[PDB]
Amino acid sequence: MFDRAQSTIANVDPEIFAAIEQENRRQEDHIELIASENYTSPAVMAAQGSQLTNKYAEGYPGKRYYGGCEYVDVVEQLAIDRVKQLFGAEAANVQPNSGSQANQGVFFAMLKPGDTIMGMSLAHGGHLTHGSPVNMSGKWFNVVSYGLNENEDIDYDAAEKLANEHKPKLIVAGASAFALKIDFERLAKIAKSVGAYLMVDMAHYAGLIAAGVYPNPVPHADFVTTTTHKSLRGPRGGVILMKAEYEKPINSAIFPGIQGGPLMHVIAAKAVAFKEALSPEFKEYQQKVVENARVLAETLVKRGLRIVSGRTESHVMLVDLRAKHITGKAAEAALGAAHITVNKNAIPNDPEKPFVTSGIRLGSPAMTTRGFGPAEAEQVGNLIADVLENPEDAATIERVRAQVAELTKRFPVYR
Amino acid sequence: SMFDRAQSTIANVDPEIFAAIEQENRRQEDHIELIASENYTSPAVMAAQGSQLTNKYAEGYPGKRYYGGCEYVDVVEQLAIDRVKQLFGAEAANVQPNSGSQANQGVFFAMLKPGDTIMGMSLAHGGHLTHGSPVNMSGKWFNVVSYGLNENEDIDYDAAEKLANEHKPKLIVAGASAFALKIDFERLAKIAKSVGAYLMVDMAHYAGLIAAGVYPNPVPHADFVTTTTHKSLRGPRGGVILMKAEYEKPINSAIFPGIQGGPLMHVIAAKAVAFKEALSPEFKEYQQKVVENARVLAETLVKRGLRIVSGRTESHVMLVDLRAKHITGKAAEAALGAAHITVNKNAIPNDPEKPFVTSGIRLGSPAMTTRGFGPAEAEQVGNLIADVLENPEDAATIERVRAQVAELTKRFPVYR
Ligand SMILES: *Cc1c(COP(=O)(O)O)cnc(C)c1O
């Protein structure tokens, strides 16, 4: 059971082996445009497959409850130091188990149940964790939301009025389906004017920010949270960045507040991902992410679709499908049949029900990771439009699927 | 390239992290681990969590996902669910919790509101941080009443019953991180029912023993049973909630969209592997050995003049009262560590020492048993520990024990 020769997934658990093999193949054989998805490196995966899963290391480097933490301390401190370097942060906590736990760490440190918070409207591109009434963020706190103006940019003037009316203890900024640069400096001014903390959840944009191709919230915010996966291209998990004055409450909130033993193998994987993100090659990658998203958007507009906000300045776009008389749900299904993975998403003032929608969200991080360039981004844009224009036509779906197969064979994810 | 498995190795990409991992692998070999919450998980479990399943966003549940493309991760998660239900006889399960802490928090988010009253076992008497500490969520946002041990150092069920009637808790937590005896879950369920409270049993420490049928199963008696997948269950690091079917909907909703986002599908694959291992006859043999080795270790320490809190062990764990040897828990932990025996200090009931000093150490057998120790080695270990406790500052003693420990760790490698 503990011989690495005999204890292989195939020998121990053939069913789980088979499912993993089919998932490996599924990742190769579909073009992934879900904007929150990426492919992480073999080195990152190897780190989280390590024996570091065996170590209980409650506490912090040099300040652990148990002995024997000399080497996991080196690992965690490298992760902290590198993520501080990436974002210019005064302090960091690399223990959060997920983006959700990173956000909850800030809330636990700084708020009490019933306190008022502001966040971006879910209907307008905010995330579940930014105040949904079925998420902790909204169930146990009093939430006021701000959204977009008529031009489909953030309505900063409206946000300012709401902040003055409701006096939130904390303002959340960031989004999961918003294509433009967010004015973090302006949001910091608004927060300061009412005595609120500013927390920026940069999960979608963190990789772009690390590469300098999207604005950095760190100089402006009290707290910045993120996933380590998504555009940062790391393992699944979370990070809190914070001003030095908040180092003690934040660290205390993560442990012993809301977590126990950190996942040290995942933290090793975070450290590896941060080393990758510090490299010149990562900056080139993110430049390509931005270019590919722009080209994809441009192509869809040429084919008669509309981009919410009118343009992208990031990795992501929300496509208004109404000109093609197809719902987001129907588009997602037809594209999936053609081996293009997207997700439905409501648009501002969507006429359709919430599980139907009039939009799809698309992002470039994953296709860019597997090597697509602008010529491929354009091809993909045209293949999408081909499906949208005849979504139930077997021949169309088959033609697109065949073209997708040529692309996925030419651009394998893992070698 | 950055995505060529030939070139993207830890050693090539991140030599500093590679070096630290190699040193940790060596550290695991070279010490005898007696921390009762520690174990060594299998190469197959590690391989699963090193897989490409880390790339998949799979918010929601099997067949009920937000995104497409979840056919294969659905197979994985449902296998995990089915196997853990089979292991414990549970009516329903949620295998998404990121940790034991998140498993507990899922139950609280589902069933309680801030300010509600809960009961849990006293931390001073063997309860866990997550059972109501004022600096943990469990205690900061809820009103906590604790119950503890009687004069015999067993749970004072009569006192727990009186407290439940006085305080009318919405939910009673049972389970412990430093308690050696069988807990009477049936009795606690009667107490909870009598005041209309939910019973949640946090079985993290005991879960592997329970799966093997060598410690009592709380599942027939509790509304909710939470656990880690690591510790005695010997899986990857993460959590599980087991629940009566009538609570399936609130529990699942509480985990997602309530307190988590995308599940860690690679870790869930690793959980499924660990559960398959736990279903095997070899795992039952392992847990029988865990119980035997803990008993032998305890017996040996008693022969050498130490005392076991509660007077005996009925599980994988023991709390050793060190007072007869005039040594603190802190001092014992340090001296043993110098001799390559890893333990942790722990307060005893009515400890005369300050909280970071203590009069006890906690010891457990899961890890040493995993690497192949039997009763002869458990007895040797007991004697080596006593040798150190009797002369903790004596260089010759520490060195002699270290040499003996090195013979044992070379004989019983963790990974081959
Ligand atoms: C995906 C996401 C999260 C949650 O991350 P999980 O690791 O899925 O818990 C939080 N915030 C934002 C903006 C996200 O996009």
Ligand SMILES: *Cc1c(COP(=O)(O)O)cnc(C)c1O
């Ligand atoms: C270790 C433990 C936990 C916490 O598990 P983590 O995975 O470290 O969050 C909860 N309850 C008990 C009884 C434990 O022993």
